[PDB]
Amino acid sequence: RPRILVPGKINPRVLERLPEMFETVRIERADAALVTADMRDVSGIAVSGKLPVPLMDAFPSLEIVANFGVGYDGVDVSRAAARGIVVTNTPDVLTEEVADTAIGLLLNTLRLLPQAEQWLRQGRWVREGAFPLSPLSLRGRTVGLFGLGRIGLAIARRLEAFGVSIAYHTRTPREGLGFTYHPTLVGMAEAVDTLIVIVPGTASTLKAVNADVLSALGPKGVLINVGRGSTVDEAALVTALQNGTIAGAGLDVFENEPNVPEALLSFPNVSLLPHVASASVVTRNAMSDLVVDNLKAWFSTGEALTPVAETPFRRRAI
Amino acid sequence: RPRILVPGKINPRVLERLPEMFETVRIERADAALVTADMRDVSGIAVSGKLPVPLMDAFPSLEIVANFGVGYDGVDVSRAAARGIVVTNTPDVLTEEVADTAIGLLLNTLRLLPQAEQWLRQGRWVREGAFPLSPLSLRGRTVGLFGLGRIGLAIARRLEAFGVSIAYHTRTPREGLGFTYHPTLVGMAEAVDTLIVIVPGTASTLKAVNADVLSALGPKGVLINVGRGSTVDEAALVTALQNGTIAGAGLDVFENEPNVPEALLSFPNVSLLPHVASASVVTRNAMSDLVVDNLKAWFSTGEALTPVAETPFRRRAI
Ligand SMILES: Nc1ncnc2c1ncn2[C@@H]1O[C@H](COP(=O)(O)OP(=O)(O)OC[C@H]2O[C@@H](O)[C@H](O)[C@@H]2O)[C@@H](O)[C@H]1OP(=O)(O)O
Numbered sequence: 001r002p003r004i005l006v007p008g009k010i011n012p013r014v015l016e017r018l019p020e021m022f023e024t025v026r027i028e029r030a031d032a033a034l035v036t037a038d039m040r041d042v043s044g045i046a047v048s049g050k051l052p053v054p055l056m057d058a059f060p061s062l063e064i065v066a067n068f069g070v071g072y073d074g075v076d077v078s079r080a081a082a083r084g085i086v087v088t089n090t091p092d093v094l095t096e097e098v099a100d101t102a103i104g105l106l107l108n109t110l111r112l113l114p115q116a117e118q119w120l121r122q123g124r125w126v127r128e129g130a131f132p133l134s135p136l137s138l139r140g141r142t143v144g145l146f147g148l149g150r151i152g153l154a155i156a157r158r159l160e161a162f163g164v165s166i167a168y169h170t171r172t173p174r175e176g177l178g179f180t181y182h183p184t185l186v187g188m189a190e191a192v193d194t195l196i197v198i199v200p201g202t203a204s205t206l207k208a209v210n211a212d213v214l215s216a217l218g219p220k221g222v223l224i225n226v227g228r229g230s231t232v233d234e235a236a237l238v239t240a241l242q243n244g245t246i247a248g249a250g251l252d253v254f255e256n257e258p259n260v261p262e263a264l265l266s267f268p269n270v271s272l273l274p275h276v277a278s279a280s281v282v283t284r285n286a287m288s289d290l291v292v293d294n295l296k297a298w299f300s301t302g303e304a305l306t307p308v309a310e311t312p313f314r315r316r317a318i
Numbered sequence: 319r320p321r322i323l324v325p326g327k328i329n330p331r332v333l334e335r336l337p338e339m340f341e342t343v344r345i346e347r348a349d350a351a352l353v354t355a356d357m358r359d360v361s362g363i364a365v366s367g368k369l370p371v372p373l374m375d376a377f378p379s380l381e382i383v384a385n386f387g388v389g390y391d392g393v394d395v396s397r398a399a400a401r402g403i404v405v406t407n408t409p410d411v412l413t414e415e416v417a418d419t420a421i422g423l424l425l426n427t428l429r430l431l432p433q434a435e436q437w438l439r440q441g442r443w444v445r446e447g448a449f450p451l452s453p454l455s456l457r458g459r460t461v462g463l464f465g466l467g468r469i470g471l472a473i474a475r476r477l478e479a480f481g482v483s484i485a486y487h488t489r490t491p492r493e494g495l496g497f498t499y500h501p502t503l504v505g506m507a508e509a510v511d512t513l514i515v516i517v518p519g520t521a522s523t524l525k526a527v528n529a530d531v532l533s534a535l536g537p538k539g540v541l542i543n544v545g546r547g548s549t550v551d552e553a554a555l556v557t558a559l560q561n562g563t564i565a566g567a568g569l570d571v572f573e574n575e576p577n578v579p580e581a582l583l584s585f586p587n588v589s590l591l592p593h594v595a596s597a598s599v600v601t602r603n604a605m606s607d608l609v610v611d612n613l614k615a616w617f618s619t620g621e622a623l624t625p626v627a628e629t630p631f632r633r634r635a636i
């Protein structure tokens with residue numbers, strides 16, 4: 001039985017299923033200092049969140065890192081690729097759930113539904129009367145998708161049924177789609193009033209949503225981020241909201257989670273979520289299964305189910 | 319200039335636009351006791367909410383009641399029809415908005431987005447970690463629409479794009495629709511796990527969503543009400559939530575607004591909104607305009623724009 005390390009917290013469903021084929025080794029945090037000599041025969045890792053390189057490099061027989069999540073920016077994939085270590089993620093099983101969350105965050109940002117519920121709950125409806133009318137609406141809006149992969153496309157499909165115009169920006173266009181392609185992010189922003197960020201947390205997208213992009217978005221502009229916090233210049237966003245450069249924002253992700261800058265918490269036109277895009281029991285169970293099934297497919301057939309693009313590897317064993 | 323009474327609160331856009339053709343007479347509440355002899359020449363009423371019969375019957379020359387809202391259950395239309403008084407409402411201009419709100423409420427109910435935002439705002443994400451996973455999801459659900467007019471149909475169109483099965487219940491079916499028709503409410507409730515109420519507040523629909531309907535809905539059942547509060551047996555709903563007879567509920571409307579029963583406020587699996595379905599500036603402006611435009615069309619051409627089905631009348635100038 002190959003020995004699989006699980007560092008820090010993970011969904012119990014992963015832990016429950018590992019014993020189908022593996023021996024599990026647990027450490028309470030993703031920290032190289034917790035590794036003992038008895039753990040040097042570890043062949044795989046299952047992890048949610050950050051995998052620091054020194055921890056990854058504590059294991060000479062490491063073959064595979066199974067990442068819990070579609071995003072795998074916590075794993076140093078360049079260093080894993082250099083060591084011949086396959087990295088897997090969890091795409092597809094969460095696509096529709098993340099897309100639903102995106103829509104719910106957008107509607108909450110535009111229509112202030114969470115604030116309206118607080119108004120009611122605080123007893124305000126009875127004595128101060130109706131919750132104020134939301135200055136914004138989805139009606140008449142034009143939505144620009146920054147990124148348009150499996151999730152971006154699922155969001156667009158939902159948006160078509162709400163009667164809004166859809167545009168998108170990607171490095172290279174997609175043939176056979178009726179949505180307006182924009183070759184630049186800034187160009188798309190000028191054209192639209194609602195910008196939904198749904199790209200990976202890469203070097204290429206770092207602070208891509210910046211002062212200029214927000215300024216082009218305009219004074220009715222709404223920013224929704226369900227991608228990675230690093231993609232938005234958090235300082236420029238705060239300034240833009242302060243100045244009324246844009247009208248509102250809804251954020252599921254932040255530069256340095258779980259910390260959210262105090263200035264963002266003060267705005268009445270902002271909706272904030274603690275990275276809940278895939279966070280339902282059913283979808284996290286499917287994600288858990290895919291982490292485990294990837295490990296099982298690797299060790300039993302030598303082919304992972306959902307290796308990442310940087311590591312299209314096949315298992316070599318003596 | 320015909321004289322139009324506006325009793326109680328209404329959107330200022332109505333009051334701003336009435337002078338295009340009319341003289342406005344205001345009373346601070348919809349109460350017959352505030353009517354003075356100088357007001358007996360009133361020809362029309364523009365009103366939001368309840369029009370008590372004694373107030374309506376204070377005016378011998380009353381020709382038209384222009385209701386602010388698609389719902390006109392606050393107006394006694396039988397008594398208006400018996401007096402030859404035309405009644406108008408505000409359909410169409412709010413259909414998409416109310417449909418968006420319905421979806422947002424459904425997502426918030428299922429995924430607990432407002433609670434998750436509280437968890438963040440209260441500092442829990444930093445201190446305790448991740449918000450707990452939502453036991454429910456929209457994934458794999460089957461939605462039954464109770465009512466399927468302009469708004470019901472707009473909600474269904476959104477839902478198709480979320481990949482869920484759609485069913486409906488109405489008194490008579492609709493030809494040329496791919497959704498499963500159910501001849502009974504209880505029968506639909508058996509077949510589905512998510513029930514969206516979107517019918518008028520009539521005698522026919524009074525307490526239609528009762529103990530039996532909820533029981534058939536089942537232990538994964540979610541009730542969404544964006545119609546009228548009177549349609550749901552509020553006592554049976556409270557009991558059903560207490561017993562775990564159903565899994566959750568989301569409510570925009572209540573039996574006796576703006577009062578909400580304390581028991582509904584205690585449940586962690588319930589989302590509550592203070593009747594905000596149409597409550598954006600842009601949509602309420604369009605509603606305001608339609609109230610006024612109805613009055614203008616009546617007095618200038620003798621034909622209202624959106625008379626209700628019970629009063630297909632044309633003006634006779636006495
Ligand atoms: N520098 C960039 N500029 C513009 N678009 C970018 C850039 N880098 C990537 N994308 C797009 O992001 C999209 C990502 O789609 P998928 O790989 O299918 O992933 P999925 O939609 O499931 O998730 C995207 C992200 O959603 C987040 O939860 C997580 O961090 C994850 O990386 C593609 O359309 C991808 O399109 P393309 O490869 O650029 O044509």
Ligand SMILES: Nc1ncnc2c1ncn2[C@@H]1O[C@H](COP(=O)(O)OP(=O)(O)OC[C@H]2O[C@@H](O)[C@H](O)[C@@H]2O)[C@@H](O)[C@H]1OP(=O)(O)O
Pocket residue numbers: 388389390409410464465466467468469470487488489490491516517518519520522523544545546
């Ligand atoms: N007793 C009943 N049992 C079952 N369904 C009922 C019953 N009464 C009415 N409905 C349905 O409700 C729908 C109403 O459609 P609309 O008249 O076009 O109204 P809309 O969709 O704009 O608004 C419905 C209600 O949405 C509420 O916010 C507001 O109070 C308003 O009365 C139709 O499908 C109408 O269908 P039908 O006339 O019963 O075939």
Ligand SMILES: [Cl-]
Pocket residue numbers: 010011284451
């Ligand atoms: Cl989890």
Ligand SMILES: [Cl-]
Pocket residue numbers: 071226227277278
């Ligand atoms: Cl994510």
Ligand SMILES: [Cl-]
Pocket residue numbers: 328329602
């Ligand atoms: Cl209003």
